[model samples]
Target: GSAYIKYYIENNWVKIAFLALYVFVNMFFFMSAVEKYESQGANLYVQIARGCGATLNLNGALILIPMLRHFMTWLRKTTINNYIPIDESIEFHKLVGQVMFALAIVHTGAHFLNYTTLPIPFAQSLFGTKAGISGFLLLLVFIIMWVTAQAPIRKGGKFALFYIAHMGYVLWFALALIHGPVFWQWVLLPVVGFIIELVIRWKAAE
Candidate 1:
């Protein structure tokens, strides 16, 4: 909580282990995509774009789990906290958000770079395709949600703005399901898990 804004782990072995795991996960996706797609004559840009797509899928699927309040509360009661830092799930969620957002930018830019290899017009292709428009909208929604969720804006009587903006996660996720040809395959478990969690939460509302 000190000058660690630019750092983490903080000499804690568990946190350090988690950091290693986090880095390994992203590298696994990146390198696996780079290897698998290289045989198809894909360029580095395309490979990175594909890797970001894969990583983003995992991140999107994972992002919601940290926010499962009941699950977090239950986990907090257990010994897993010693190893996993369950109490810091919100910070983890924020970290995921930052990572996903940065990856999305790289993903988008990589594709744009790859576009130069083709003869098609970028504007026409970007505007006229299901994948393109949906991807653009997802980024737009991400920006709004990201901005409002910032520390400054979330306070100062602006909680409602944050609340309303954060609701765009529905649009973001739905558009994500639409944005890629087969991303639904990746997020099915997470989507179902979210639904089941929502059901349980609502069942206890009375």
Candidate 2:
């Protein structure tokens, strides 16, 4: 235990701490949602769906952090870099993307099964709602992005194509904002980071 603590403190402790917090937050949201839904007499699937949605909310909000290149560069120059693997930012971003993708799949499937079994008018309304439509579209976009981002395709000099397709995340994040139950606290930090990075980029360009 002592050796492990020493190793973690010497290397990647910042990254480890951040990841631990990230995971704890996600689980807290998930369990909270599950408890709420279950107390409301919701079924198993609904409870699972709510939990997955909470996880997705967090994943969506955080997925932008690693993309803040200028911000990450600045961070790398700081003493914090001694503990955080800032060079692995992009890889961490992809890992977050994969987590979001899994959550998206579970969320969609659970809701799809729930909605389709509802009465006709209600089911139609479910599909007709803006959030519903956007959710469907997001799922489609994620499918395409995930497929094209696989190791073989991404590394086969098709990286440019993969990158182009990944731009669909703009649409994904927009739709997510419209989907309701916004967790502003989860999202605000990354948005601030993005703005800071943009300002840095503009200043550098000048």
Candidate 3:
């Protein structure tokens, strides 16, 4: 509460703008990724949609979340008189975060529908004997993230819950890298996102 205010009082509106631009642009990118490859094979498109849905949610978490720790440190830097109050930007952050959650559902549901109707191996399409294990993990993590992103739970001091829940995203990234096309890879925007996220997080935490 006070910590959020401190961030506001610091007039670090640039961070707020950066945060908004970061999440929204990533949102469009994820949505675009899902749309881009839909013209591919049913099996292939299923994989792409699943990837977009799962990764978009995690991307939301990873992007908006550095604020938690960043704000905590900001709070620690405040003196008694320096206490700040919650402002509109943080409120907007929360709003966008919720929208991101809804997008995750669309992503997930689209994948489910696509796969259920896909002519490929159903069991193997998801819980395959090989390669798609990362996709499975991606599905698992996003669902958990959606559950935890709820406003009621978040207001009840479950912000910590939401924060830790997203750690699986980093793990999901690793798994997705190897479970690839197994050959020709034009551009791995999703995989590259994971790497860049890891680098930025490492820098922030460092």
Candidate 4:
């Protein structure tokens, strides 16, 4: 009974810190988005759309950070290691993946409402606008990745298919970059971090 409450308190605090940060950032994005779009003469869903877009960028920036397998071993030895559950990296990665999926629904669904609020030809809306075309493709990639990520696909012996399909993340990011005009910062940051991590690994191998 008192085992976890008394012994695991340090790691628990670290997890709480992470959880708090996630909640804070999402809330921050929503507020900022609503303020920016509130007076733009659009329906309420437009505000929701903008907020989810911003949060998507935020989450996208972080999608790879938790998956730094090699660096994590070194990370786990740091001063804060005792407080952190370093091995839970994949667990946190999955948590963020869930957020990405949930927010994608909100972002896309809100835009669906966005298209409805303002009339435009359905054909023209998709092919004519960067947001529409890129977004639709991003959703396609999202669906593909999500499908192959399932245990039935990934763990059932088709890991190759899962791996190849998940590579669509590059396409997803590219399309996401095209989908949102202001998402460049988010896209750029993740690329830089992943490259740095990769370089570190290569140098260590040499």
Best of the candidates, lDDT:
1
Candidate 4 lDDT by residue in tens digits, 1-206 = 78877676654877888789889988998779888899786578989988888888888988878777767766787876777778888888878888999899998889887777567876677668887888988988998998898789999999999999988877887787777876488767667777777887987894
Q: Give candidate 2 misplaced runs (Cα > 4 Å).
A: 1-10, 121-126, 181-186
Tell me each candidate's RMSD, in Å, in order: 3.4, 3.1, 8.6, 2.4
Superposed by TM-score, candidate 1 places the C-alpha of residue 50 at a distance from the truth, in angstroms, of 0.9
Compared to the true structure, candidate 2 yields what TM-score? 0.86
**Alpha-carbon local distance difference test for all models:** 0.84, 0.83, 0.56, 0.82
Which rank order by lDDT, best down to worst? 1, 2, 4, 3
For candidate 3, the per-residue lDDT at 77 reads: 60
Worst 10 residues of 1 by lDDT: 2-11
Which candidate do you rate higher for TM-score, 3 or 4? 4
- Expressed as tens digits, the lDDT of each residue in 73-176 for candidate 3 is 44446562133333333554556556655655565566657667857876766676454466566556757866776776756789899778867656654554
Which of 2 and 3 is ahead in TM-score?
2
**Candidate 1 lDDT score at position 116:** 76
**What is the Å distance of residue 120 in model 2 from its true position?**
3.2
Question: Of models 2 and 3, which has the larger lDDT?
Answer: 2
Regions more than 4 Å wrong, model 3: 1-35, 38-65, 71-97, 129-132, 149-151, 157-206
Cα lDDT tens digits for candidate 2, 1-206: 99998886767667778889988998999999999999999888889999999888778777888889898998899887777778888888988888888888898878877775567565574678776877887788889889888888899889998989989888877767767545646678788888999898998894
